[PDB]
From a paper:
Phytochromes (phys), first discovered in plants, are red and far-red photoreceptors that are also widely found in bacteria and fungi later. PhyA is distinct from other phys and is responsible for the very low fluence response (VLFR) under a broad spectrum of light and for the far-red light high irradiance response (FR-HIR). In higher plants, phys share a conserved domain structure consisting of an N-terminal photosensory module (PSM) followed by two tandem Period/ARNT/Singleminded (PAS) domains, and a C-terminal histidine kinase-related domain (HKRD). Then, we solved cryo-electron microscopy (cryo-EM) structures of apo-AtphyA, AtphyA-Pr and ZmphyA1-Pr at resolutions of 3.8 Å, 3.0 Å and 3.3 Å, respectively.
Specifically, we well defined a small NTE fragment, the knot lasso (KL) in the GAF domain, the tongue protrusion in the PHY domain and the PΦB molecule adopting a 5(Z)syn-10(Z)syn-15(Z)anti configuration in phyA-Pr. In contrast, the 150s loop (T108–V122) in the nPAS domain and the 380s loop (N344–K361) in the GAF domain are completely disordered, as in phyB-Pr. Notably, the tongue in AtphyA-Pr adopts a relatively stretched conformation with its tip locating much farther from the bulk of PHY. The phyA-Pr HKRD dimer is essentially asymmetric due to a striking kink that occurs only at H1 of protomer b, resulting in local disruption of the symmetry. The most striking difference between AtphyA-Pr and AtphyB-Pr occurs in the HKRD dimer tilt angles relative to the PSM–PAS2 platform, which are ~30° and ~53°, respectively. In contrast, because of a smaller tilt angle in AtphyA-Pr, only marginal interactions are established between these two structural domains. The angle between the two H1 helices in AtphyA-Pr is ~30°, and there are no obvious intraprotomer contacts between HKRD–CA and PSM in either phyA-Pr protomer; this angle in AtphyB-Pr is ~120°, which is much larger than an ~30° angle in AtphyA-Pr, and intraprotomer interactions are established between the HKRD–CA and the PHY domain in one protomer and the GAF domain in the other protomer. Structural comparison revealed much more extensive HKRD–PSM contacts in AtphyB-Pr than in AtphyA-Pr, indicating its higher conformational stability. The lower stability of AtpyA-Pr is expected to be more favorable for Pr-to-Pfr photoconversion. This may contribute to the higher photosensitivity of AtphyA.
Residue numbers in the entry:
A (entry chain B): 73 to 110, 120 to 347, 361 to 539, 546 to 588, 742 to 1040, 1050 to 1119
B (entry chain A): 73 to 110, 121 to 347, 361 to 539, 546 to 589, 742 to 1041, 1050 to 1120
Amino acid sequence: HIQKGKLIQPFGCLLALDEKTFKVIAYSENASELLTMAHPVLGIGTDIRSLFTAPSASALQKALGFGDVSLLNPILVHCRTSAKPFYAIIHRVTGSIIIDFEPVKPYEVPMTAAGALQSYKLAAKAITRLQSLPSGSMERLCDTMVQEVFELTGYDRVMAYKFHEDDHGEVVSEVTKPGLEPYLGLHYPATDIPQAARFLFMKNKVRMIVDCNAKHARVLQDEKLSFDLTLCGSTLRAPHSCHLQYMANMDSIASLVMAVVVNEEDKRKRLWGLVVCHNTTPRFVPFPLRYACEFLAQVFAIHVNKEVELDNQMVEKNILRTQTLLCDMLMRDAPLGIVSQSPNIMDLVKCDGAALLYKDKIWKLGTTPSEFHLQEIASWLCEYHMDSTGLSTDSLHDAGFPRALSLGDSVCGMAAVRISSKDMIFWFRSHTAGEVRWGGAKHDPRRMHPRSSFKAFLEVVKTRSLPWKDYEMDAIHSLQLILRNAFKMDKFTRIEGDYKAIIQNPNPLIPPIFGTDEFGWCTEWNPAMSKLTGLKREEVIDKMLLGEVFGTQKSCCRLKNQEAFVNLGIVLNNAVTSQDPEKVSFAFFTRGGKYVECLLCVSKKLDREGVVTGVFCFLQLASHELQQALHVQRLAERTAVKRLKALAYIKRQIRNPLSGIMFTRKMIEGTELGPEQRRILQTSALCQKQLSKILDDSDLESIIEGCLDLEMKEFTLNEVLTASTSQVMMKSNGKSVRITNETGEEVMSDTLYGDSIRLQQVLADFMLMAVNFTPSGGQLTVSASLRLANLEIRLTHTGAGIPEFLLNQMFGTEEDVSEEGLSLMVSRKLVKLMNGDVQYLRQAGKSSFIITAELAA
Amino acid sequence: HIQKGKLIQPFGCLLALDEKTFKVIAYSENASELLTMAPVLGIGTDIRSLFTAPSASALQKALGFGDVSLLNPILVHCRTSAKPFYAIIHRVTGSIIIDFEPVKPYEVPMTAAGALQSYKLAAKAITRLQSLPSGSMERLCDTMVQEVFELTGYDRVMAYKFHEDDHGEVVSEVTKPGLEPYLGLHYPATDIPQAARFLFMKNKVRMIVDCNAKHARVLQDEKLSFDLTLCGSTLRAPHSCHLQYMANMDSIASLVMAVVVNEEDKRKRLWGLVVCHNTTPRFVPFPLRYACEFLAQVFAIHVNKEVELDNQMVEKNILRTQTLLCDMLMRDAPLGIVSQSPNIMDLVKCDGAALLYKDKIWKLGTTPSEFHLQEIASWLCEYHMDSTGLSTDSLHDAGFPRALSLGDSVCGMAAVRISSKDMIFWFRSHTAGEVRWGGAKHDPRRMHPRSSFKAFLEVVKTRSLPWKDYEMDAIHSLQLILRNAFKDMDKFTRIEGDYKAIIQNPNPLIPPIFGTDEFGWCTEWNPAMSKLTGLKREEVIDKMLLGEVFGTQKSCCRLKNQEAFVNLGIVLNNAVTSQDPEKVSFAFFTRGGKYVECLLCVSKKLDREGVVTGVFCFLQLASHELQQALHVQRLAERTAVKRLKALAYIKRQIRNPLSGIMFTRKMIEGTELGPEQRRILQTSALCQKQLSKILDDSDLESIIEGCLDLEMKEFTLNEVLTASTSQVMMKSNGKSVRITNETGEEVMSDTLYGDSIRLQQVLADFMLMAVNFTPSGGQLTVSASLRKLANLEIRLTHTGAGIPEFLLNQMFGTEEDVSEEGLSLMVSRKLVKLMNGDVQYLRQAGKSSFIITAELAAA
Ligand SMILES: *[C@@H](C)[C@H]1/C(=C/c2[nH]c(/C=C3N=C(/C=C4\NC(=O)C(C=C)=C4C)C(C)=C\3CCC(=O)O)c(CCC(=O)O)c2C)NC(=O)[C@@H]1C
Ligand SMILES: *[C@H](C)[C@H]1/C(=C/c2[nH]c(/C=C3N=C(/C=C4\NC(=O)C(C=C)=C4C)C(C)=C\3CCC(=O)O)c(CCC(=O)O)c2C)NC(=O)[C@@H]1C
């Protein structure tokens, strides 16, 4: 049924011919009407040449003679009768060649695309905008991809549908033109899409259905041999009745499904998901557009695959940071030092609280329960856990604890380790919320018919909190080893999904470490270094590290050349002089002849009284890609050291006279006067505070990304409107343009809660260019209305209006952005942060700005 | 021939030991007095009896070591007197030689006792050398010479450098004030005997303490069957001829350091020397002359990375020439070669160009007369028929009868013949070649050194720069292009070998080229691409370029993976719309396992009617280092653009509220104003005006260089002083600092003719940091004196210890970071210097004074 089925959609015709005789043997029922109806009859034994013109016949013959027909697929042919062009898509199967003919609509791309490259040309804008995006954001990539698919196809309600590890699908993004229901975040069972279709989407990467209720046309074979004739590869295949019923229940009758195949992991291609478009009315799309979409999907898959590895780099970067911090704590003494100094045990692993139980004393910091609660915790640990030195229970409620209920919500995520019989360490986490809105019946790992489970659902969780990862437990184990060694097996459990007795042994995380005397003799050579190099601590000790241990000839470890020797000496001397570790590239040859290339971090050793008593160094074995990225960043950043200095200088030289006007205004406000210039003083102080808070902002990218912090406080609309109008009265009077305020007294005197400074900035800039783009003698009317408080702001200014290129700039659809356009985008992003939008309206002689803001009243 | 020398310098002692039994077999006459005096030193004496047991214990360890050079300088005390000495040990064939040098009481304790402690003394010089941006050799040489000057402390330091003919040329020099410069002089190759050049590759540091000093004898053992070599010892005496040469140069002490670079065949090569000269006897401890052997090694490393950066400029020039040749490949006949924006003058570096086409002349710059062009063509035809191109550095030496008529305008010419009569000329102007050549002339025993180093000059005849090897290749490529285009070996002569005409053979520079029509089929596949890939043209043409020729399977050239296929399609489609030649990374496999990695450049094939007919692509075979450098530059440009936009953001959002403050101030002026409120109003106006001017400035480097145009106006000192004070008294109240003024009323009432904004900014900054450094409850007094042109002197005296000297050094402009405070200090000092003044810092017990001097106009 999904595989074969002598039924095809009726918007095209099909013809299956033999490999050698080039004679028709399978023909669709509607082929005669579509092709030869103004003559040979389309019956078994008819040729393909008779019913087509000489150039069309020659082109078809050449295409059939071609080896890889997948390149020149859209072969625009002409009927033997008057015109009637047809696209002539071609597929090959074992023993047969199937040609699908589709009518060519003259009003849309006639002869524009007749090959793979011309078809691919139709997605250039989408491809270049996908490429132009910055890296590091998967959700941004998905949103852009679905938005471009929606714009290019002309459908509605396009959606990205991602497959999880259990094959249950989840909607990730969506874009719809009207105000229909948003399908976003809903989860669907893994049985919605059968394994047959999922495997069939490995090939036939684009599937199209035009009408649900269209009467399918039968395809009749020949009664002679070669009964095998499969229609899986054809673009005219009748969808299965079950999916037909499902789509009918889903108030859609058209569909265009494109598979996303990520070619990563060790072929081994995996179906990441689908880009599904659903239409409530019949829709047809020319083949070049559907071939341009099978190319955009490949580009999207490439970008997703390349984002996965950028995500992967962060884990190893965090591991390197943890190793550095572990060495830092190794350089200290006593259990008091891990918590006393700045980088504490709260920084070893992400958490919300830390506790140390040392000799019947508690050192706690962060979100921790009461001391007696920890005492009962330790009593239960020493009463029921003797076989393990630790554990990681994500939910203390799930594990056995009589008093877990009364502990609270900010607890029950634990990681505990016993340094000794009594003295132990605890890491505590709070609760993390999480819920799902399953779109139907949960799969809970056919002739089933439709079920109409496209309604709603809700599932919640509890204080189970975030899971504890593996390298985190490795870090805690390494800290335990360090503390135990400093004082003078290691099996502990894990309780994740209430399954008891999950015993696992982790591995230490200590990096290779070596250390030299002040003269140069080698003193410290830890087992990790012995494993990495192959040497033994006994045979490398009381020797010169520069020249004997590391040397170009007759040395245990061989440096490549003399430049490495010079650089090693330079970094040793600099580290004895300079402060804090310096990372340098370091490469050598092992005893067995294997090249090793890592990073070296060196730092001075210290005694109890001042003097430097040697050098302590360790190696970071970063991966090759991280090393290249760090090297490129280091090389490139050497040319950019002046920009921050200039920025700081400008900030200082603006802050000084800003304080000067602060001080003069302090005098002016100090002396008592009448009301009007006191009001002017208040407005000037408000504008000057706006200037000051604009100054302290550091980076623009925070505003662009829409993550800027908001200061919430009281204000009134009258003062903000007056300040904004005052900021541009001078420019309004420069062009003699009158500005009027039609806001009512009730709205004007309203008291609201929000960020008045940003609102004043936005309104002042809008009024500013409204004055700019209003011809002299014109009028600009600003009105405000209040309706959770919704502030509606109308700016109606006379004149022709702002040119449309600036409009496409402010909407963010144009990459070429001017400084004015910079002001526009910043303003629009801030308005979006304020739960609103900025709109532009053009009428005869009047251009009007719509501003919508959300404020608390 | 120095192995026979048996004479040593008298500043130390030399002691030889037999390799087997560690007994004395050679002692200098100086050793008996230097060490023993407070047993008789003879043959076979036990070395242990010479020094104390704690001191002698380190010795046997040192001789027992494998590579003793890692622990050479050993502090040793004698057995009885316990006088400190530095011992340096080295090994000769069948013997161990030790040199003992007295330890000067400059620093008798601590110091260095190994090869790594001594290296520490050059850390500052190494850091300064490493912090220098790359690109120029002159900066490196001057920095190296300056650091040597600072470290050693000799009178003169020079960076003598060898040329190909082994003749030297001083490249840099930094001397004590006075004396006599030597920069630019050239010296004969006979000043450095080959023996010294060979010896320096083994002993990289050589010291002479006194040319005229009483020497000592080695007193070799009679029982030795071999002569004791003294070449490697640091106490070896030099040659008498070289002593006389030092006497002629008016120098006594000397400390030379060889520079050895690694030239790929790796082979050592003596790049040059670093020579230190002193007019008086001088002594330097061993650790310093071991930190100089390390600094020289670092300098040699850095002087071989400014040679690879010069092998990349040539490759970049080759790539640019190839791009320009491809540009001329698609053009309409001749007369578009000359008229269009890139012309023949951009092909090779020349001063003039000319084209002779069908008895007509086209010119593009400094060229001789048209009749002179016809005469040149006639002479070249009547004298050279078996050559299609010629290159002469000098036309007079070439044999041109009328070369003297041209004069200084043209000296060198490169010409090619596209047709029988039609030709192309590049003319390069005459340049002057002058060499100072001090001393004597260089032209390829008991000889005594010359007594005079007179600087007699040398000058060459009428000559220009020589035509390089690849310039002829570019000209030949243009010749081939025009020859092929006209239809629809060659034996170029290059007379510069000084042996009349020598005939060479050039090779073209044309890069691999291919091209497709609008449907994707291959249409152009040039021989260079065939050589690069191995595919003959007839095996490729009329095939789908993307999918059949370049594909991931069953294709002529195999791409690596699917991403390359997608990227190639994307580039081929984007080239039709963008039209720009876009360099993209390309990589493919040839017929046999060759992973070619190059740069693809694609451009459309727009025709006369304005309709495209395919694409035209060519590769650019570039080395990995050049590709990485281009990638790094491209990465940095985006960051620069982003930072520029980010900086441009803030100015508008500061200016708009500023405009608000201005409008409110005008409305305040419109309303009622009191007497003192009026004064506060003008102070606020002045301060906000200063803010407006400082914000509206866009280029700080304009002020830094000195191109800032000050706003000439009229003002008074009292108003500027009040405006500058009002900016800082908030911090004065923050630290409870009391500000006082002692200026006379006449100066306040005096009218000043100048810029008040800059003076106000400078004064505000000065009192700001003066209050910052003033302790709580302190005093800050301002005194202004005006003398009538009116000279103004301002004294700012504040309580406290004082501003640290590093801030003053940053003010004077002697630091890199400088810091916000230091940079503001430097800017204020430069602005005062524009007023022909300076900022002075005076320190007294509990007092610190800023002194500012300036001049203005008065009426
Ligand atoms: C006499 C036979 C000729 C001669 C002999 C000679 N020269 C050397 C060694 C050196 N000559 C040096 C020359 C220079 N140093 C300078 O200051 C300048 C110019 C400003 C020059 C040209 C230098 C340096 C050396 C290296 C040794 C050193 O101690 O500096 C020797 C070898 C001596 C030894 O150590 O055995 C000899 C035999 N040089 C001459 O120019 C005269 C004509
Ligand atoms: C029948 C009782 C079961 C069933 C069968 C079935 N489904 C398909 C194909 C598809 N199912 C799709 C599902 C979704 N699309 C959406 O919009 C969402 C969620 C938002 C879901 C879950 C899609 C898409 C397809 C592919 C359509 C296509 O044209 O390729 C098939 C294969 C039909 C075919 O013609 O190959 C079959 C047999 N699906 C069910 O939900 C029930 C349980």
